[PDB]
Design a protein around this ligand. Structure first.
Ligand SMILES: CC(=O)N1CCN(CC(=O)Nc2cnccc2C2CC2)CC1
Ligand SMILES: CC(=O)N1CCN(CC(=O)Nc2cnccc2C2CC2)CC1
Lengths: 304, 304
């Protein structure tokens, strides 16, 4: 029993972190096989960030201008290329600790673990979600760029995020490992406002199921609703619309607890309208939305 | 910017996890040098847990009755001894991945990371605190016993907790790595009720400083208080008394933000009396107390 915001064990990713320096800028890189991936803004000065022409700035850089250090040992860079907003630095040595891996592009609402790093060294691990506005609410200071987000399926690490930017509002933006930004964000120091950060409804319902499984049941009510009625309330509260696909995904939690998905929707509808009244659910005074239905099943079953 | 509940990178601890089986019970063990540490209740049947005589039950066990498996390879047990509530299984092979380590006994209010494991395999990592009633609010299912809590200081892992029990109320109890339980708990399936789970005041203040550093400043008020006046309110709200030692520990955060510790106490006093009014601080609707002042400085500075 008990339910925690839990990150994946970070060891497999720690073995991939390296430091990348270009000129006066140092950030993190991800070393997989003989390639080091890092944000292309490693080539920029503070001034360059205002309106960078990456293709032009990159012409002035050679392989020897990218300093890659793994622990206290220097890697030899034998090639470099830009793919979208990431640089791929080909090195002469395959990372001996390369785990089984995939590069995946996640959808909003999906959760992942971040291994926050500085100077190629891991500082901490935390769990977050791709927000519906394509930002993430992370914990990143200057030097954390190139830190990555990932999920693990037994022994395969699916990398889904690489940190690039902090928006003027303190929220974060980054790319998948092919260098494509999530959402409309760009690697330029300019006005980039985020859209509405709506609540991930299917994750809230999954978390209410985790609460019932772990004994917190006070919010269960005598009501039911329909998808259309629920969605009218969800729209009003800036919650994402719930679809039949989401109801299907919640099926195993509904089966385990015996609480129909639409009945849990009705409980959530009353929590939205009435509030918590100073009460808590799984130690929280707000409805948590950074646990997917898969995370709830995984934690409640004990998948290693 | 941004502030997350962050655990230490778990890799150094993942390299120490092993599976320990005795008869029909399988749990986790911690392999450091040539010793495997695990809860002594690995020797108990479900019936034994009701009123176990560990010294008597242990007489019926020999070295060959303890099966230790590291990955898919079996370790040879050449000695076994009980130290308080843990067994120390001497093996013929030193763990090649043994990090620099210490065994420490933490005080209530101190935080640590847990690497939750099943069958010697890591499932996730999360952050928690030793509650003032000596319980921890973890996420542990059957098979998680022997999972450990730790802190890291650069390259040295200080192990502070080993999981042993889930109380009838769903909260958790365990020992330090010398096998001494935190608090009054025992490794027996009997009535063990926890005391008052008070809020760790100095951690709440540290977290309010993290909020100011990260832009959430709405709760800062025009008031101050004294330790004695603050403590009268803290007692009423089931918060731990704040001491001059706590004020001293908050000194660096006070210096960084320019907000005197007693002024932050006055802001906290108004939050306790007035509530949040539907507002949030660092994405939370309740006052978070599982960040120590050291955790706040570490995260806000980027220690690796
Ligand atoms: C060379 C340069 O001025 N750069 C290179 C691009 N970066 C982009 C950027 O947003 N990085 C960043 C990401 N997360 C947290 C914090 C920061 C930094 C304090 C801003 C800004 C700094
Ligand atoms: C042999 C036996 O019956 N044991 C051995 C001692 N254990 C003690 C115990 O509290 N373990 C435990 C810890 N955390 C979460 C969950 C559990 C278990 C479901 C109870 C109980 C089970």
């Amino acid at each position: 029993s008990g339910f925690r915001k839990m990150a994946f064990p970070s060891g497999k990713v720690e073995g991939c972190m390296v430091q990348v320096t270009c000129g006066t800028t140092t950030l993190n890189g991800l070393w997989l096989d003989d390639v080091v991936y890092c944000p292309r803004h490693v080539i920029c000065t503070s001034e360059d960030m205002l309106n960078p022409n990456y293709e032009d700035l990159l012409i002035r850089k050679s392989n020897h201008n990218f300093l890659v250090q793994a622990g206290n040992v220097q890697l030899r860079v034998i090639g470099h290329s830009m793919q979208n907003c990431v640089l791929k630095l080909k090195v002469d040595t395959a990372n001996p600790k390369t785990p089984k891996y995939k590069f995946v592009r996640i959808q909003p609402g999906q959760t992942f673990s971040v291994l926050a790093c500085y100077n190629g060294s891991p500082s901490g691990v935390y769990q977050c979600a791709m927000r519906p506005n394509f930002t993430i609410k992370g914990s990143f200071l200057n030097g954390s760029c190139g830190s990555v987000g990932f999920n693990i399926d037994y022994d395969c690490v699916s990398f889904c995020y690489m940190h690039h930017m902090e928006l003027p509002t303190g929220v974060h933006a980054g790319t998948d490992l092919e260098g494509n930004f999530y959402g409309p964000f760009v690697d330029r120091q300019t006005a980039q406002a985020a859209g509405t950060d709506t609540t991930i409804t299917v994750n809230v319902l999954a978390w209410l199921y985790a609460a019932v499984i772990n004994g917190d049941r006070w919010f269960l009510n005598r009501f039911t609703t329909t998808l259309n009625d629920f969605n009218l309330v969800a729209m009003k509260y800036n919650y994402e619309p719930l679809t039949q696909d989401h109801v299907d995904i919640l099926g195993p939690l509904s089966a385990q607890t015996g609480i129909a998905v639409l009945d849990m929707c009705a409980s959530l509808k009353e929590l939205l309208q009435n509030g918590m009244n100073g009460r808590t659910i799984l130690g929280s005074a707000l409805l948590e939305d950074e646990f997917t239905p898969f995370d709830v099943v995984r934690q409640c079953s004990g998948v290693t």
